[PDB]
Symmetry: D3
Subunit: 136 residues, 6 copies
């Protein structure tokens, strides 16, 4: 059988993945991105200001991991939005909509019991390395 | 590198995906389907009657998104069943078993803190566009 | 279009998947593995001793499903660690790190409201059938 | 391993087989096209007029086989031009150029000792089913 | 990019190489088979009896190369029949038909000026490793 | 279906086209290389010295086309050696061996009636872009 490419993604522009995981793994053409919190890459802790500020930082973190893999937000095909409070969905969704223009990823959003670091939002994503011919 | 196909799936037979997400995204041969609640496509709200009725509607919604992608339930390879109450697993599983006959998807099922719309069940799925040669 | 391979994975060395799901599904080159609890394959119930003992059993279960698919832990590309208590993350992570040496999977870890069987940890994984050429 | 598509291409718009071969075989996305003489599709006989008329008919036949496989001449990636007479090279090149207007295929062209039915030219091709990317 | 499988196919059931070539090369799923003369595998000499016997032996040799690559004649998608004498066309066609019983490959068949060792026929082939889909 | 890469390979390090063909076509990962005569790349004329010198130049030209496509001779999977004179077989084999040092391609080699420009040898090839796996 063919030997498929696997690339470990690492960038200093996003919180370091310490311990036995990677920021993202590209395998064949699919990139599995680890869930990102609203963590500042240089502080090792949550940015202040609550769920809206954390959502902006989380998506900035995802964007920097995508860039390191040669992609941008147009390559995302599926995402999961995990919340500490379901009532924060609308506010987080108003941040999320700023990162996508069309051909939107599949998505699930729901409230979990707790996230690491006391986070109020965590975003996971799957992307596919381009080029991609988008039909509809 | 080759340009892989990406298709955005949209059908009126399932609740519309309003905002920055799609009902499903087909990319290469893999379809990522957004989590479906027991929402009536024409009412914009949960069907009445509780978790069993919602589970039937959620799976009907998934079925209509699959059809729009040229698939049926035999193309599903992985699913996630999210519950408002773990004790509803058996009742939801008795609905779920009606949609699959053999070569069953991988699955995870667990209780979350809250789903959108006050839902009691949400189902996510991954499918692969056929033809598929099923070995075992 | 080409007919892609789908294989249903079943091994007696891991808890049987009773009902309408499979331990894992291999489709093309990607293996979707059902979430595994710290369940003893021969008892049908959780191993005693708490979250650390359950985490060891869960990962042993994943390992036996991988073996049945012709893989080992080096083929895992993404994993999810679901917890009954976020404060158990460090203890579970000290077990998890024993199964991986390098080129670590993408990962998400968080606390859910409840797992089946009263479990304190559940691990889901995605693997890709080898050979894999790991770049970095 | 996956099961790859293999399809026999057959159209009555190209000449019937005069031996144990298919007009073309599509396998995965590559189409191997049998050598075409300048035979009229309805009668199976070589068209009159010599190498120029036979070359036009052979390429017309290839075109109908490509069309049956959902392709046109832009899908051809390689071709072989077998001549009964190397002095016909310039004449056949001028015919050939009119069918392959862009993304010219790779090619080999030379004289053999004899072609079936006394043909003056026979043309083989390899195509790849689209879509293909552009420069 | 992915690393594609490339394997040299070699079997003692087919004649040893008399030059700098492999019996066949498998790359991804396509198998390019070298031109086969009607040589006996054990001795490397052309079998007696002329074009009919040489054609049978050449096709038998192709069959053993296919078998070594996990294939049979149904995996062949394209072939080339090189003749020393175009008048042998009907005789070679009748031999060839007995090996290719279904899904007939694409083909080109014609006379060249000379084959190695004075062979009267040489046959090349391209195959695709299965599984392949059916009509 | 996916859009497969198709690229015309063209380098001034190999001779300019003297007809309606590209030096090579890359499609997906397979490279079809046009027949190369022993023509000098700068002048387009056959090198003096007969079949041995022409064979070296033809293979040098193939090498430059492979290099333009990010390949070398180890990527070649199949080749065809067309001779004006079958008695040159041993001489051409000795030249050919010096370029293909490992993983020898599949091959067909025989005499045709005439080559363009009065060439004594013409060589075609098929390559697959790497990476390829090893034994
Ligand atoms: Na959503
Ligand atoms: Na809070
Ligand atoms: Na389950
Ligand atoms: Na309720
Ligand atoms: Na993690
Ligand atoms: Na507990």
């Amino acid at each position: 059988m063919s030997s498929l490419v696997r690339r470990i993604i690492s960038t200093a522009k996003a919180p370091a993945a310490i311990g036995p995981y990677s920021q993202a793994v590209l395998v064949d053409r699919t990139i599995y991105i680890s869930g990102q919190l609203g963590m500042d890459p240089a502080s090792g802790q949550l940015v202040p200001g609550g769920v809206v500020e954390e959502a902006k930082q989380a998506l900035t973190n995802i964007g920097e991991i995508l860039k390191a893999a040669g992609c941008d937000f147009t390559n995302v095909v599926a995402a999961t939005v995990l919340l500490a409070d379901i009532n924060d969905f609308s506010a987080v969704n108003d941040v999320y909509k700023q990162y996508f223009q069309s051909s939107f990823p599949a998505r699930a959003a729901y409230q979990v019991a707790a996230l690491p670091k006391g986070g109020r939002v965590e975003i996971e994503a799957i992307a596919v390395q381009g080029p991609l011919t988008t039909a509809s």
